[PDB]
Write a protein that binds this ligand. Structure first.
Ligand SMILES: CCCCCCCCCCCCCCCCCC(=O)OC[C@H](COP(=O)([O-])OCC(O)COP(=O)([O-])OC[C@@H](COC(=O)CCCCCCCCCCCCCCCCC)OC(=O)CCCCCCCCCCCCCCCCC)OC(=O)CCCCCCCCCCCCCCCCC
Ligand SMILES: CCCCCCCCCCCCCCCCCC(=O)OC[C@H](COP(=O)([O-])OCC(O)COP(=O)([O-])OC[C@@H](COC(=O)CCCCCCCCCCCCCCCCC)OC(=O)CCCCCCCCCCCCCCCCC)OC(=O)CCCCCCCCCCCCCCCCC
Ligand SMILES: CCCCCCCCCCCCCCCCCC(=O)OC[C@H](COP(=O)([O-])OCC(O)COP(=O)([O-])OC[C@@H](COC(=O)CCCCCCCCCCCCCCCCC)OC(=O)CCCCCCCCCCCCCCCCC)OC(=O)CCCCCCCCCCCCCCCCC
Ligand code: HEA
Ligand code: HEA
Ligand SMILES: CCCCCCCC/C=C/CCCCCCCC(=O)OC[C@H](COP(=O)(O)OCCN)OC(=O)CCCCCCC/C=C/CCCCCCCC
Ligand SMILES: CCCCCCCC/C=C\CCCCCCCC(=O)OC[C@H](COP(=O)(O)OCCN)OC(=O)CCCCCCC/C=C\CCCCCCCC
Ligand SMILES: CCCCCCCC/C=C\CCCCCCCC(=O)OC[C@H](COP(=O)(O)OCCN)OC(=O)CCCCCCC/C=C\CCCCCCCC
Ligand SMILES: CCCCCCCC/C=C\CCCCCCCC(=O)OC[C@H](COP(=O)(O)OCCN)OC(=O)CCCCCCC/C=C\CCCCCCCC
Ligand code: CUA
Ligand SMILES: [O-][O-]
Ligand SMILES: [Cu+2]
Ligand SMILES: [K+]
Ligand SMILES: [Mg+2]
Lengths: 90, 131, 459, 100, 100, 65, 47, 230, 186
């Protein structure tokens, strides 16, 4: 069980927890497999994860995007504020 | 075959192949310091580099382990014998960035500073052409 | 007799006595360093004798780690109370216990004699080659001392492990602390011996491991494979002491005893697999760096659990009991101080932050807050708790609020400014520096002289 | 009589570990598409061509490699002064006649 | 001309057109020692085939300089001139397959 | 015997000869000297002075003393 | 560029490369977490 | 009623042994070092006598304590060899393409593996007799013959090797790993020269210790053979 | 946890169970000298260590740490172009090690590197995309992320479209400014 208070595991799943020694072994094995899987399934996979046209845009992204789009803030935010180095001295 | 040794066409047509220049950078001694020089950090030959350019620094150590550190450029690479470590940098502003060896290297570990001056690309080209 | 005694409690006293003696030499070296660093210029070391400074910093580190704090927290308090905590008559291996302390003294004499007779040069306490292998005979003498010290450490570790076979009571948390340190020694020392032998081979047998086509980074792997387990071999006994003091003085049973024990076991396993956070700037592969950075940050979890379990021990304790005893103050001060040292450790654990902060005085302040403040105070607190049992007198420490306050204030004056100069930046293992770093260096130096003066008031 | 380890622990974890190592390596090669055909030779193309010429009889047998390059180092210049491939071949021919 | 022409032909070409960039075979590691040794071996093999005066081999030396520090090259270039450089021994005088 | 019950009985019963304490402090004092004496000796060996004068390795004003 | 007197420079100072800015911000990002860890624990050091 | 333990109150061997060690450092002659080694042997033997005389206490836990110490020591021997294997493999990327002659995979490995296996069989027979409260005189002399041949073969190999320690880290690691194994072989001679039949039989820690150590050394040679010869 | 020795303890079948643990716990024990005492001590240990809720948290941490550790070791051996266990390529000069060069590019482009590099704009204020473009093709072209890294990055707005100055600090606007002065190409 991941991020689980084991007091809860003991209460709600009494039969699965009856053998506490075996329960401890599963705890180790489950988290061992999780760590192993992360390396070879999240980090290792070659030539993957480079689809930057598919950046996830969550429901909160759109709420805030539409709010600014409705007003002029989105246009103003994206506008380039300065594209010159020196001001002109009068 | 000649083609197993790839060479750009310009050089095959007689263009001069570039040479390399080496110089030694030494600490300025206490008795040789000038009124405005920074003690423990000045050197007699600085390393000039162009700004707004991607530069590859290859760092190694000949005899013992030194460490080339330039805090302003965010570089701290160990100059270890047998390892030619690649460090990439992109300077954004002109100036002179001072650093010191960061690996105990013997008696004068505290007396081999690292001075890098970043100048405009037009200035760097003129400097390199003359020096 | 004096030298022939096998009594485990007498030998424990010998370890504390010798740690204080050797400690005088350690503190003196520290005063030399801070005096020199008071301003820019030469103050007490000539520019032609800069090799002496390199030797001072090297010996300071080696002596304080292997001849003072380790003999004090792993040899002194352990040999005196462990057989009592185990409700056993005496230590399992009486004759081995005697030779261990004699070995420590003999290796100390070799080191100090090498100062007097050999040319004085230094290569750091980490003895990095090729610098260590191109030096003079003083390096050879120091190697002999370390190997001899290693013999004493391993046999003492064997001695403590045998308590499991004879313990007649319950393995208390403190006993668990020593056993795990013993395991860490049994697994780490043999690797250290091998790499030290290779340093000798290149120094004395014309070997070529640390010359071109041989990787000098190899030494750093094997050294630090022992190096970092060493820092936990030095802290874990301190943790064991803190647990006893808080429970006893607050009259509160240890909370989460099994979590305390399992936290100590966890720290050991993790501490045995994170060594390369000392080698971040060499140029290791990206995946290696990420592994070591990830596992290094994990060590905070078990270490954090112990800290919070200590806090609840002090919470809720009876108000009528006087809380100004020096042992209690030191135990509480350890929690406050260790958190500072550990948090800064997590900061340096991020490798990108480490690029800026490697070989700077920020690292110094980090391990001083844990060792020079935390470990020292823990050893003092432990001895103070056992004052009646040990029976020493002729000191004014047991109830001395002035000593605790002055020590805490002045020790922080020394090392807090060393965090600042780490972003200035002032490299480590240097004596001369730019004039714009004098202020902070001066403040720390004023702190060092003051702390020494406070050490005289105890008598 | 009470057992602590697997009844066949030594063979189990020895052969078993070897099997897992071998199988995992094949899987790794497949995922990266590594060529699995063993070549025992050097890949210097010009050299392999000179060796074929020797096998074809275009270059005389036992001719040294430094007798064929367009740049010689000092030690190979020393050797070229005493090199006589024709004499070497005659000596080998004499040995064969004596043997048969 | 083709966009992927650099990768075609050899992996060597990539750094030959972009001398100051990472070589595909060594970009995974910060340590570039092995990169220097490959580049020097390639200069050594060029001269054996084309001579020292050929512009190709002169450029193969410039490429070697891009990754090899001068103090290493000077030493390795002396060994090469004597005839003791292990990266330049003619293949038929190598001992790598002898006694094991 | 009652005298042998306590380890280091003379010290614990506060009858020990003070010389034992003096030797312990002397031993610590000698240990400290191993850091100072070689400093003075090495300074003189390579410079001719036992200790430097602050900032005597740098340029000093005319009136500096 | 160069150290200056009596400067805290907490986390670094005067970056001149994008990587240098990254280093400063990484420290600044974690610094409030460190303060939280310290304050939250120290507040409970009492009877 | 008696005390659970017969406490040892005083010991003077520790001072002597520690002084003997210092002589190795504080000396101006290598002959002094040779004779100092004899002093060490003598005093280590006295400590062993103290262990044998502790049998008079009739303490059940003494066997267990000593046995577990040996376990720890064996562990330290295994971890020292690991450090040499580590040193060897760290520079693996610079092996097999240098102009040196590495060792054959036919002659040395086979005769050595066959030899060391016979050594194990002898020790195994000694254990079997130990179990059966029996003795066979010829066994120890077979060990002496095996050790003699091993010494004869290793000496010739080193003297007839055409590559030296300064030629490459490969050669240094080869010589050092082989020497480390030999030293452990010589330590086995040191232990086995005293083998005799003792009538207290299976309460004697010597017998179990010898069996474990010999097996360790032979197993260590299997690892070396795979790394270097094969 | 039963308090009477008469009441049996439930055990699963397998290699890590209550029965498996009982068989091996007292192998080296001098204190378990009879059935009654042996069972009492066995249940005492089981109650103390396996019925302790917080102890299971450490079991999770050791498994996770060890799993990562075993996998990083294995990955180096199996995929890292610079780790050699076979010798064929080590018996050849560097230019001829084609089979080992095949590991190079696949190993240079792990998934997490492609997934997390776009999030450099949460650590860099000026020109966070200074190194995005590379004409060679050994690595993918990089596109800056649209959101801040989840967690402790409160100093930057949750989404970069919210930030007013983000677009004006891009390497593209900076290049425009400097190219207008003739100062530099990039
Ligand atoms: C031609 C030649 C041919 C070839 C020839 C070859 C020959 C081969 C020979 C081979 C063998 C040679 C060696 C023989 C050894 C014999 C040992 C033996 O059997 O002795 C039995 C013998 C028994 O004596 P006894 O005849 O029954 O009577 C003894 C007396 O009655 C006294 O009774 P006691 O024993 O009760 O009293 C002892 C005690 C009495 O106590 C006191 O003196 C007062 C109480 C203590 C005061 C505070 C001391 C500081 C705190 C120390 C804390 C740790 C202590 C650890 C335990 C002690 C370790 C020594 O004081 C001491 O003697 C020493 C006290 C501790 C000194 C060190 C403390 C640290 C100082 C640091 C200073 C620098 C910083 O042992 C002894 O008592 C003496 C042993 C002496 C061994 C000395 C070894 C010294 C090594 C030093 C380093 C060497 C390298 C560098 C040297 C450089 C020099 C310039
Ligand atoms: C970090 C520092 C601050 C720490 C603060 C915090 C502390 C917290 C508390 C810690 C408490 C820890 C636990 C304590 C437990 C105490 C148990 C105890 O008392 O055990 C009983 C034990 C022994 O009592 P006992 O049972 O009556 O023993 C009777 C004897 O066995 C038998 O009696 P006997 O009279 O027959 O004794 C024999 C006696 C016979 O003695 C005599 O006949 C002595 C004659 C007078 C000699 C006086 C010295 C002369 C020196 C001359 C120098 C000349 C230099 C000239 C230079 C010229 C230059 C031009 O001695 C000998 O024969 C051998 C002596 C060997 C040891 C002394 C070595 C001295 C240094 C040598 C250096 C050599 C370097 C050579 C280099 C060569 C290079 C080539 O007590 C001691 O040994 C004394 C302990 C005293 C301190 C206890 C702790 C108190 C609390 C701490 C205070 C602060 C200390 C700070 C450190 C020191 C700072 C300097
Ligand atoms: C430690 C020695 C190591 C030697 C290694 C040598 C390796 C080479 C091959 C040697 C082959 C013989 C067997 C070696 C294995 C060990 C044997 C054994 O356990 O004996 C136990 C046997 C009795 O042991 P125990 O403890 O009393 O009883 C144990 C059992 O309970 C009861 O035991 P068991 O009755 O069951 O017997 C076990 C059986 C197991 O062995 C076999 O059955 C193996 C058969 C292998 C056949 C190979 C063909 O062994 C025998 O039957 C051994 C018979 C030995 C008779 C020796 C009589 C004296 C000979 C004197 C010769 C003098 C020559 C002077 C020349 C002068 C020229 C000018 O021990 C002896 O009798 C001592 C001698 C052991 C054998 C030494 C072999 C030396 C060979 C030298 C050859 C020189 C040639 C020179 C040519 C010059 C031309 C010009
Ligand atoms: C006993 C001494 C001791 C102790 C305990 C530690 C503990 C730690 N050290 Fe260590 N360290 C040294 C002694 C010590 N160190 C020495 C002597 C050196 C220099 C050697 C040399 O280079 O010569 C060094 C160097 C050193 C470096 C090298 C920096 C550099 O070389 O530039 C690093 C970086 O990874 C590091 C990290 C850590 C970490 C991450 C911990 C962790 O153990 C800290 C864990 C503790 C905490 C994290 C605080 C308590 C926990 C909580 C409050 C829970 C909540 C906190 C979080 C969730 C983060 N240490
Ligand atoms: C635990 C080990 C330990 C201890 C206690 C100390 C204590 C001190 N150290 Fe430490 N120091 C190191 C270990 C230690 N140090 C190491 C390992 C290095 C790096 C070495 C290297 O760079 O190569 C180092 C480096 C180091 C330097 C860096 C010099 C350099 O390399 O440039 C400096 C000065 O700035 C310094 C100063 C001090 C000071 C002023 C004290 C203290 O004086 C502060 C005041 C505290 C006290 C005076 C109390 C101490 C008392 C005891 C230790 C005795 C305890 C005994 C009992 C309780 C029985 N130390
Ligand atoms: C007993 C019968 C006889 C058996 C005889 C065996 C003789 C040979 C034994 C050699 C040592 C054991 C490994 C054998 C490997 C065989 C397959 C092989 O060649 O593998 C090669 C392959 C890589 O080869 P290259 O192509 O050169 O590199 C490409 C870029 N990386 O290497 C391996 O896989 C072998 C080396 C690693 C072995 C161990 C597995 C790796 C992970 C170790 C994890 C350690 C941590 C703890 C794990 C605990 C359990 C999960
Ligand atoms: C509940 C938990 C999961 C929540 C959802 C997570 C999720 O989907 O994240 C996706 C998101 C990608 O989304 P976008 O960038 O928007 O689109 C991709 C564009 N190319 O992924 C991430 O942010 C990255 C997640 C990484 C998880 C990493 C896990 C650990 C991996 C190994 C770490 C290192 C281990 C030690 C070293 C190993 C060396 C081999
Ligand atoms: C405690 C006992 C177990 C310790 C296990 C430690 C393994 C940690 C794994 C670290 C890791 O990923 O290894 C990389 C790291 C080297 O990385 P790079 O120099 O960047 O080279 C990689 C490609 N050239 O590996 C090592 O250094 C391994 C050192 C060997 C450890 C052997 C421990 C033996 C214990 C008995
Ligand atoms: C080496 C130190 C090892 C210490 C731990 C093991 C000690 C051990 O078992 O020694 C005893 C054991 C058997 O004695 P028992 O009377 O059966 O048992 C003692 C009382 N029960 O003795 C031996 O192993 C015999 C030793 C003989 C050879 C000694 C050689 C010494 C060489 C020193 C070289 C330097
Ligand atoms: Cu060079 Cu320090
Ligand atoms: O060292 O942490
Ligand atoms: Cu560490
Ligand atoms: K100074
Ligand atoms: Mg460093």
């Amino acid at each position: 069980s991941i991020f689980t208070p084991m007091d809860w595991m003991f209460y709600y799943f009494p039969n699965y927890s009856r053998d506490k020694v075996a329960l401890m072994a599963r705890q180790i094995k489950i988290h061992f497999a999780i760590g192993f899987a992360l390396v070879f399934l999240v980090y290792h996979p070659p030539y993957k994860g480079a689809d930057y046209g598919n950046f996830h845009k969550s429901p909160l992204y759109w709420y805030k995007y539409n709010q600014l789009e409705r007003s002029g803030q989105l246009q103003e935010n994206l506008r380039i504020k300065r594209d010159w180095f020196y001001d002109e001295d009068p | 075959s000649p083609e197993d040794y790839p060479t750009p066409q310009k050089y095959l047509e007689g263009a001069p192949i570039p040479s390399w220049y080496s110089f030694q950078s030494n600490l300025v001694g206490d008795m040789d310091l000038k009124p405005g020089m920074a003690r423990m950090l000045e050197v007699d030959k600085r390393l000039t580099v162009p700004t707004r350019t991607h530069i590859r620094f290859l760092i190694t150590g000949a005899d013992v382990i030194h460490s080339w550190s330039v805090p302003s450029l965010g570089i701290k690479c160990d100059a270890t014998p047998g390892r030619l470590v690649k460090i990439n940098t992109f300077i954004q502003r002109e100036g002179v960035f001072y650093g010191q060896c960061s690996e105990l290297c013997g008696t004068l570990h505290a007396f081999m500073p690292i001075v890098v001056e970043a100048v405009s690309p037009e200035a760097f080209a003129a400097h390199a052409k003359k020096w | 007799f004096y030298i022939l005694v096998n009594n485990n409690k007498r030998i424990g006293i010998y370890y504390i006595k010798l740690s204080i003696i050797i400690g005088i030499l350690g503190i003196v070296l520290s005063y030399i360093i801070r005096v020199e660093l008071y301003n820019s210029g030469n103050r007490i070391i000539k520019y032609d004798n800069v090799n002496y400074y390199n030797m001072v910093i090297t010996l300071h580190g080696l002596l304080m780690i292997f001849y003072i704090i380790m003999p004090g927290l792993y040899g002194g308090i352990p040999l005196y109370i462990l057989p009592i905590l185990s409700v056993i008559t005496d230590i399992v291996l009486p004759r081995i216990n005697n030779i261990s302390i004699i070995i420590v003294l003999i290796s100390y004499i070799v080191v100090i004699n090498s100062i007097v007779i050999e040319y004085n040069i230094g290569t750091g306490w980490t003895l990095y080659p090729p610098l260590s292998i191109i030096g003079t005979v003083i390096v050879n003498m120091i190697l002999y001392g370390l190997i001899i010290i290693g013999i004493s450490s391993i046999i003492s570790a064997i001695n403590f492990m045998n308590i499991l076979i004879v313990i007649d009571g319950i393995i208390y948390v403190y006993i668990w602390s020593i056993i795990i340190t013993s395991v860490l020694l049994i697994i780490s020392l043999p690797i250290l011996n091998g790499i030290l032998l290779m340093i000798l081979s290149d120094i004395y047998f014309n070997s070529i491991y640390f010359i071109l086509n041989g990787d000098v980074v190899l030494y750093q792997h094997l050294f630090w494979y022992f190096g970092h387990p060493e820092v936990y071999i030095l802290i874990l006994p301190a943790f064991g002491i803190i647990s006893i003091i808080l429970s006893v003085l607050n009259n509160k049973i240890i909370f989460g005893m099994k979590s305390m024990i399992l936290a100590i076991i966890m720290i050991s396993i993790l501490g045995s697999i994170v060594w390369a956070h000392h080698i971040y700037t060499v140029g290791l592969e990206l995946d290696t760096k990420i592994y070591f950075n990830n596992l290094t940050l994990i060590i905070s979890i078990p270490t954090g659990n112990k800290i919070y379990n200590w806090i609840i021990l002090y919470i809720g304790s009876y108000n009528i009991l006087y809380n100004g005893y020096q042992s209690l103050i030191f135990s509480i001060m350890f929690i406050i101080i260790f958190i500072i040292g550990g948090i800064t450790g997590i900061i340096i654990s991020i490798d990108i932050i480490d690029i800026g902060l490697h070989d700077t005085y920020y690292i110094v302040s980090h391990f001083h807050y844990i060792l020079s403040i935390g470990a020292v105070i823990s050893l003092l607190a432990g001895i103070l708790l056992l004052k009646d049992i040990i029976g020493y007198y002729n000191v004014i420490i047991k109830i001395n609020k002035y000593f605790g306050l002055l020590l805490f204030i002045n020790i922080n004056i020394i090392f807090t400014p060393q965090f600042i100069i780490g972003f200035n930046v002032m490299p480590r293992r240097i004596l001369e520096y730019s004039d714009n770093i004098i202020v902070w260096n001066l403040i720390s130096s004023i702190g060092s002289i003051s702390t020494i003066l406070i050490l005289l008031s105890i008598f | 009589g009470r057992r602590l380890l697997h009844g066949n622990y030594f063979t189990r974890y020895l052969f078993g570990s070897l099997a897992v190592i071998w199988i995992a390596e094949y899987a790794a090669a497949c995922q990266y598409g590594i060529p699995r055909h063993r070549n025992p030779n050097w890949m210097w193309s010009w050299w392999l061509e000179k060796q074929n010429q020797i096998k074809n009889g275009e270059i005389p047998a036992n001719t040294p490699g430094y007798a064929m390059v367009k740049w010689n180092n000092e030690a190979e210049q020393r050797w070229l002064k005493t090199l006589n491939v024709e004499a070497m071949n005659e000596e080998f021919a004499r040995r064969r006649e004596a043997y048969y | 001309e083709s966009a992927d022409a650099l990768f075609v032909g050899t992996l060597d070409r990539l750094t030959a057109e972009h001398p100051h960039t990472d070589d595909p075979r060594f970009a995974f590691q910060s340590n570039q020692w092995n990169n220097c040794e490959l580049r020097f071996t390639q200069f050594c093999r060029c001269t054996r085939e084309l001579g020292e005066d050929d512009p190709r081999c002169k450029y193969q030396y410039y490429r070697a300089q891009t990754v090899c520090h001068e103090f290493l090259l000077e030493d390795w270039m002396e060994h090469r001139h004597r005839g003791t450089c292990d990266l330049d021994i003619m293949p038929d005088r190598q001992v790598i397959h002898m006694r094991g | 015997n009652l005298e042998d019950h306590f380890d280091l009985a003379e010290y614990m019963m506060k009858m020990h000869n003070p010389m034992s304490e003096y030797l312990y402090w002397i031993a610590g004092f000698v240990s400290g000297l191993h850091g100072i004496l070689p400093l003075l000796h090495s300074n003189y060996y390579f410079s001719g002075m036992f200790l430097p004068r602050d900032n005597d390795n740098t340029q000093l004003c005319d009136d500096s003393w | 560029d160069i150290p200056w007197p009596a400067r805290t420079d907490w986390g670094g100072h005067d970056p001149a490369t994008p990587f240098a800015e990254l280093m400063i911000n990484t420290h600044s990002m974690f610094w409030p977490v460190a303060i939280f860890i310290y304050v939250s624990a120290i507040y409970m050091v009492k009877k | 009623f008696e005390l659970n333990i017969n406490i040892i109150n005083y010991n003077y061997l520790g001072i002597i042994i520690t002084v003997i060690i210092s002589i190795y450092i504080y000396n101006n002659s290598n002959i002094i070092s040779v004779y100092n080694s004899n002093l060490l042997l003598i005093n280590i033997n006295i400590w062993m006598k103290y262990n044998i005389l502790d049998m008079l206490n009739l303490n059940v836990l003494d066997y267990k304590i000593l046995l577990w110490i040996v376990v720890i020591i064996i562990s330290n021997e295994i971890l020292l060899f690991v450090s040499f294997y580590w040193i060897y493999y760290h520079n693996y990327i610079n092996y097999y393409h240098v102009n040196i002659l590495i060792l054959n995979s036919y002659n040395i490995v086979y005769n050595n593996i066959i030899l060391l296996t016979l050594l194990s069989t002898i020790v195994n027979i000694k254990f079997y007799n130990y179990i059966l409260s029996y003795y066979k005189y010829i066994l120890s002399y077979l060990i002496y013959y095996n050790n003699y041949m091993f010494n004869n073969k290793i000496i010739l190999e080193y003297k007839n090797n055409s590559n030296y320690t300064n030629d490459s880290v490969y050669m240094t690691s080869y010589f050092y790993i082989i020497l480390l194994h030999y030293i452990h072989i010589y330590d086995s001679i040191i232990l086995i020269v005293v083998y005799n039949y003792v009538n207290y039989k299976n309460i004697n820690n010597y017998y179990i210790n010898i069996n474990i150590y010999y097996h360790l050394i032979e197993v260590l040679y299997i690892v070396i053979s795979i790394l270097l010869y094969l | 946890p039963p308090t009477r020795l008469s009441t049996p303890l439930y055990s699963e079948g397998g290699a890590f169970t209550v029965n498996w643990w009982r068989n091996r716990y007292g192998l080296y024990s001098r204190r378990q000298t009879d059935p009654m005492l042996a069972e009492f001590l066995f249940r005492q240990q089981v109650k103390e260590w396996f019925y302790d809720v917080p102890s299971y948290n450490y079991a999770a941490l050791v498994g996770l740490a060890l799993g990562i550790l075993v996998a990083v070791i294995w990955r180096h051996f199996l995929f890292n172009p610079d780790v050699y266990v076979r010798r064929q390529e080590l018996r050849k000069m560097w230019p001829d090690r084609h089979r080992q060069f095949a590991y190079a590019v696949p190993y240079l482009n792990p998934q997490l590197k492609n997934l997390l590099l776009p999030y450099k704009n949460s650590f860099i204020d000026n020109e966070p995309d200074y190194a995005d473009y590379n004409p060679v093709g050994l690595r993918p072209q990089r596109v800056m992320a649209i959101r801040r890294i989840p967690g402790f990055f409160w100093a930057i707005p949750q989404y970069f479209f919210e930030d007013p100055l983000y677009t004006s600090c891009s390497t593209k606007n900076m290049q425009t400014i400097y190219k207008k002065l003739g100062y530099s190409e990039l």
